[PDB]
């Protein structure tokens, strides 16, 4: 689980990378959410690459190119955006001097990535980019330093997020593979969508789901497993989902408590 980071005082970097519409977007709120709920103050930041804006969709409010912390978060605004290079760096310091502006620093970006898969791209622009200058000045020792800046863990830290389902599975392998190669910190993976222990005839999907938990067991012991539950788009019902983020979610628990938050979304049973 990641109360890892839900604590993680040193982490000026968090991207959650998802592509896939998994409630990624909702990861990352649950991220941010629990983790500036958790540090309770010491406000972080949440942007989303997101082309779907989805996020502003997520918290009940409408976001854009300016911070705007969330009502009932007295630490915690959002921020949505979109050559590629371009959009990433120019738009990527947008945020970044455009806080150095607005009044102080402010602690840290929950990073919501582009589904788009584009965000790749945007997460190697410096690497090549201090080569072209090394053998062609104040944002060129910028580089330098800030590409091994990223490369730091206790600073930069990836996360993916997962259904059971194997495909994602093999895109998630083929994933972290490249992430590797960029050298960056990775370690941790939230899954999502799970039913746990009549609906029987549902967990009889579980059953499936189940074995595809433990060949992510095996195949990662160097990571976190979250297992999550099962979008929603509540404040409230986007925080109670985050306190299983963190603390390790439990089918004695899980089961109340999400029970009663289906019956929030108005979710006799039935599939169809
Ligand atoms: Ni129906
Ligand atoms: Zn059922």
């Given at each position: 689980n990641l109360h890892s980071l839900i604590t993680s005082t040193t982490?000026?970097?968090?991207?959650?990378?998802?592509?896939?519409?998994?409630?990624?977007?909702?990861?990352?709120?649950?991220?941010?959410?629990?983790?500036?709920?958790?540090?309770?103050?010491?406000?972080?930041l949440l942007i989303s690459t997101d082309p779907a804006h989805n996020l502003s969709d997520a918290f009940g409010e409408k976001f854009g190119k300016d911070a705007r912390k969330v009502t009932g978060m007295n630490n915690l605004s959002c921020m949505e955006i979109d050559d590629e290079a371009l959009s990433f760096m120019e738009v990527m310091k947008h945020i970044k001097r455009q806080e150095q502006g607005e009044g102080e620093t402010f602690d840290?970006?929950?990073?919501?990535?582009?589904?788009?898969?584009?965000?790749?791209?945007?997460?190697?622009?410096?690497?090549?980019?201090?080569?072209?200058?090394e053998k062609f000045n104040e944002l060129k020792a910028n580089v330098e330093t800030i590409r091994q800046q990223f490369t730091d863990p206790d600073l930069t830290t990836?996360?993916?997020?997962?259904?059971?389902?194997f495909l994602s599975l093999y895109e998630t392998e083929r994933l972290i593979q490249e992430l590797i190669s960029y050298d960056m910190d990775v370690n941790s993976i939230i899954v999502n969508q799970l039913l746990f222990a009549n609906c029987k005839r549902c967990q009889a999907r579980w059953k499936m789901q189940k074995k595809?938990?433990?060949?992510?067991?095996?195949?990662?012991?160097?990571?976190?497993?979250?297992?999550?539950?099962?979008?929603?788009?509540?404040?409230?019902?986007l925080t109670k989902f985050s306190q299983f983020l963190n603390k390790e979610y439990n089918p004695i628990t899980d089961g109340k408590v999400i029970y009663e938050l289906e019956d929030k979304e108005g979710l006799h049973h039935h599939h169809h």
């Amino acid at each position: 689980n990641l109360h890892s980071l839900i604590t993680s005082t040193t982490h000026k970097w968090i991207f959650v990378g998802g592509k896939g519409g998994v409630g990624k977007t909702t990861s990352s709120c649950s991220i941010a959410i629990q983790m500036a709920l958790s540090q309770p103050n010491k406000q972080f930041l949440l942007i989303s690459t997101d082309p779907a804006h989805n996020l502003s969709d997520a918290f009940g409010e409408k976001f854009g190119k300016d911070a705007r912390k969330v009502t009932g978060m007295n630490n915690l605004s959002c921020m949505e955006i979109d050559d590629e290079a371009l959009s990433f760096m120019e738009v990527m310091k947008h945020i970044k001097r455009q806080e150095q502006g607005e009044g102080e620093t402010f602690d840290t970006v929950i990073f919501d990535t582009a589904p788009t898969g584009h965000t790749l791209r945007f997460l190697q622009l410096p690497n090549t980019l201090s080569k072209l200058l090394e053998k062609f000045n104040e944002l060129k020792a910028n580089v330098e330093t800030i590409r091994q800046q990223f490369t730091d863990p206790d600073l930069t830290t990836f996360v993916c997020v997962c259904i059971s389902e194997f495909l994602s599975l093999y895109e998630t392998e083929r994933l972290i593979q490249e992430l590797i190669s960029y050298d960056m910190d990775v370690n941790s993976i939230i899954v999502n969508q799970l039913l746990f222990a009549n609906c029987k005839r549902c967990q009889a999907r579980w059953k499936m789901q189940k074995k595809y938990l433990d060949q992510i067991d095996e195949l990662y012991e160097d990571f976190h497993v979250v297992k999550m539950p099962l979008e929603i788009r509540g404040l409230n019902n986007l925080t109670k989902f985050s306190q299983f983020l963190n603390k390790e979610y439990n089918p004695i628990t899980d089961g109340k408590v999400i029970y009663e938050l289906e019956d929030k979304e108005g979710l006799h049973h039935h599939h169809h």
